[PDB]
Structure formats: structure tokens, C-alpha cells
Subunit: 139 residues, 4 copies
């Protein structure tokens, strides 16, 4: 597969425990040959005071799954550091959970670029984001 490291969803969620990731109710939910997803509930933990998904939190989810995906595409001795991220919020979301799928745009020796698209339970696109990661050698 695209991944260079071995892993399990159980282990990834264990790794993300007791942090902002688990605090937001984010869960690494599934993965394929060249994509990985995380879900996040749409509730008082992730909504703006007026009842809709908080766009800033949608970006937090995007950076989470994209950075995780990036790290899984590196051998031991190397990791990724988030350089920058951007996102367009396309529509309001007020219930259920959203699903963010991270897919690679380009994985180079020094820089990785990831695409993260977030959809509602109705499979409607609510946010599109791009993440730029720096590949560092733990030397």
C-alpha cells in the first residue's frame, strides 16, 4: 500500500488519546490503499454557539488526519511537521458526524502536500482543505 508503516485503527486512536484530538471526539475511522479517514461529531463540543459545525474545528480535524496520514507514509527515523493549511467552508452542518478523508497530492523527500475533503453523513462536501507538511530527518 501507500503506507510505509504498519498500523491498526485501534493503535492510532490509542496514539491520539488524551489530546485535542480525543477532546474533539475525533476518531480515526477507516483507511484504504491510499486514503485514511477520521470522523468527528457535530455537537456542542464542535459547534459554534448558533448550532452549526464550527469551521475552525473542521480545519483542526483536517490537519489531524492529514498530518497522521503524512507520518504513516514515512519510515521510522522521519516525521512530519505542519507548515501551513488552508480550507474553504462550503455549507453549514448541524447534526450527525462529518468524515474527513485525507489523500496525497504529492509526497516528496522534503515536502508533502495533502488534500483533505470533509463530508456530512449525507455524503455532501462541507469543507475542502490542503495541508503542507515538512518531512524531517530525526537524525
Amino acid at each position: 500500500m501507500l503506507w510505509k508503516k504498519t498500523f491498526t485503527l485501534e493503535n492510532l486512536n490509542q496514539l491520539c488519546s488524551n489530546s485535542a484530538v480525543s477532546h474533539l471526539g475525533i476518531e480515526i475511522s477507516a483507511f484504504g490503499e491510499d486514503w485514511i479517514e477520521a470522523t468527528m461529531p457535530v455537537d456542542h463540543r464542535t459547534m459554534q454557539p448558533f448550532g452549526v459545525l464550527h469551521g475552525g474545528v473542521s480545519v483542526a480535524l483536517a490537519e489531524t488526519i492529514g498530518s497522521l496520514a503524512g507520518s504513516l507514509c514515512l519510515e521510522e527515523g522521519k516525521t512530519v511537521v505542519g507548515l501551513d493549511i488552508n480550507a474553504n467552508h462550503l455549507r453549514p452542518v448541524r447534526s450527525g458526524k462529518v468524515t474527513a478523508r485525507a489523500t496525497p497530492i504529492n509526497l516528496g523527500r522534503n515536502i508533502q502536500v495533502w488534500q483533505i475533503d470533509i463530508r456530512t453523513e449525507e455524503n455532501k462536501l462541507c469543507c475542502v482543505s490542503r495541508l503542507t507538511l515538512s518531512v524531517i530527518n530525526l537524525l
Copy 2:
């Protein structure tokens, strides 16, 4: 002065209770004639699994203060909706709380562009972000959405 809506930090923080804002420990902390700030602690609620501030959460803070700021620059009957945001993470933060200050770049009739810079308690720049907002006429929006 920039503001077109009256407000108090007490009421704003009350309004933000039971939301993603309060959940992250974010507090609207100060304001001036043309800027407003929000603080956020660096702890289990906002850190990555390895002890440093989560970059995504930093953007969550930036969108929070930038959007609030924009809504306060409009008269009753109008509000804002976040269109897009971008940010560069400049350095890791491992303790204390960070302060995000939102300042206007351009406040147009249909679009607002805001600058949000986040600094550590050491006054060091850890994140820079730009937020684009759509100005919505509530009356018009209702008539076309209901």
C-alpha cells in the same frame, strides 16, 4: 472605532459557553478601537499527543476571534459567514496560553478580510492566519433560504 454592535467580554464569553469555543478553553480576553483578542490554554484540550499546541486547534482559535470580530463590525440585521481561512505554523508552543489578535485588512460591503496573529506568553509569533468572510444580509438571506 470599528465596532457597530455593542458588546461586553462577559456577555460574549457567556454567548460562547457550551460550544466549541468554551470546549477549547478559549476566552475573549481584550479589545481596542480596532482589534480584539482571545486567549487559549495549551493543555490536554488543545495539545497534540506529543505535548505541543495542536496546529489545527490554533486555526480554530483564529477563526473564532476573526469571525467574532467581523460580526461586531456590522449593524443589526447583518452577520458574517466564514468562507475560507489559511495559516502558517511558525513554531511549537508547549506551555501557558496563546493570545490571538484579530485586526481588519479590509471591511467591504460584501466581503471582509481579517488578519489573525497568534503569540505565545513570551510574545513570540507562533501562527499567522487570514480569514475571508461573506457579509450576509439576514433579511435577504431569509427571503432566499427561509
Copy 3:
């Protein structure tokens, strides 16, 4: 289809004459039901001093085709205004022409979001861009 305005590639290139578009040798080259492309040569008009395609000019191409695509998706009497754009440069390009394809992410009543991917003659992705547009009534 996706388009709401009637058009021919000939007329679109005519529309772009004597502007930054023709000055950069950009040509509106092809279109499908939900995508439109423009090509641009990699030469002294578009290269960096060191012999590779100028990244800033790639963005110019992206904004050009994305903005054109957006206006063609609106009824007559309406057009678009570019609000913001971002892009990641993935690899250097030294020769040939690049092709930028614009496809919609979300087309709303007041805002449009477009995806623009630029490829080399070898069909390798050299730039990915996202453009946000404001829809305006010329009246």
C-alpha cells in the same frame, strides 16, 4: 451541462486578446461537460530567471481559467470577481506547455469555489490551486 452561457473557444480567446492572458501566451484549449482547460507555454515569457516555469505565473494561469469557468457557469447578466486564491508548487517544469484544468468544488448563489490543477505535457501534476469567487449582478 454545467455551463449556462453560450460560448466557443474561438470567442473566448478573442475575449482574452490584448490582456495579461494573451501576453502570457495562454490559450483556452478545451472543455468538457464540467471542466475547462487553458494551456500556457514554458518560455522566456513565463519562466523564472533560472530556466523553470515561474510559480507566480502558474497561479496567473490558474486564476485565469478558474475565473473564466466561473463566469461561464452563470446566467447572462452575471459574472464573477476573484476573492482569493492559493496554490502549492509541486515540481519544476522546464519545457513544453502546461495545461490547467478547472473543475467546480461548489457553485453557490453568492460564492463559487474552484479547483485548478496544472499538469505538464507528460501529464505530471506541477501545481494545485483553489480559487474563491464572488458572483455579481452587473446591474
Copy 4:
């Protein structure tokens, strides 16, 4: 002072000659201890078909001056490569020339982040951009 390399404006314009930069009429126009500027005309070479400055071309100018500034902040033997760039177009510009000023946000050993604000001849902000660069040998 930010600059690690020695140069004159004439050198910089010579460096950018016979490229997209000179093709767009861009001229490195002035510099200070921690900032550098480039101007660009608003004419048929840089306008959209409807008479206003082409937003994409504004980004071209932004990347040009920001990338140049970044390389000048490095020791001899080192340069930069543009990783990504973003920009918000704030208002239409229909005449004269615009001036883009690049100022640093953060200069690291491997990555540099630059702010580039573009103003009209009336000193009105028409575009704001941020550029991310990678430092290479």
C-alpha cells in the same frame, strides 16, 4: 539588517531580466533594512480583458518579490524554492503601477514565510499575500 548577500537594485533587475518578471514589466524598485519592493504597471500586459489589474498577475508579482527577498536573506551558496502562496484581492486597480513590499514573517533554517502587501499609487491596499519558501543549497 536582514540581507546576507550584497547587491544593488541594478544587479537585481539584471538578475530578473529576460524572464517572466521583465516580461510583466516588473522592476525591483527599492529596499530598506528589512523590506524590499517591486513595482508593476497596470496595462494590457497585466490587466484582465475588462480593464482592471489581473489578480493572478498580482500573485505573480507577489511571488517574485517575496522569493527574491528570501534568497537575499541567505548566505552565498543558498537559495529558495517557492512551496506555496495565497492571496486575497481587495479592490480593483485600473491605472498606473502597483507596488509590492515584501517583509519577513519568520526566517528559519529550512523554511521561510513572507508577507507581501501590494498597494496602488494612491497607497490603497489592493492585495495581501503570504508565501512559504523552502531553503536549499
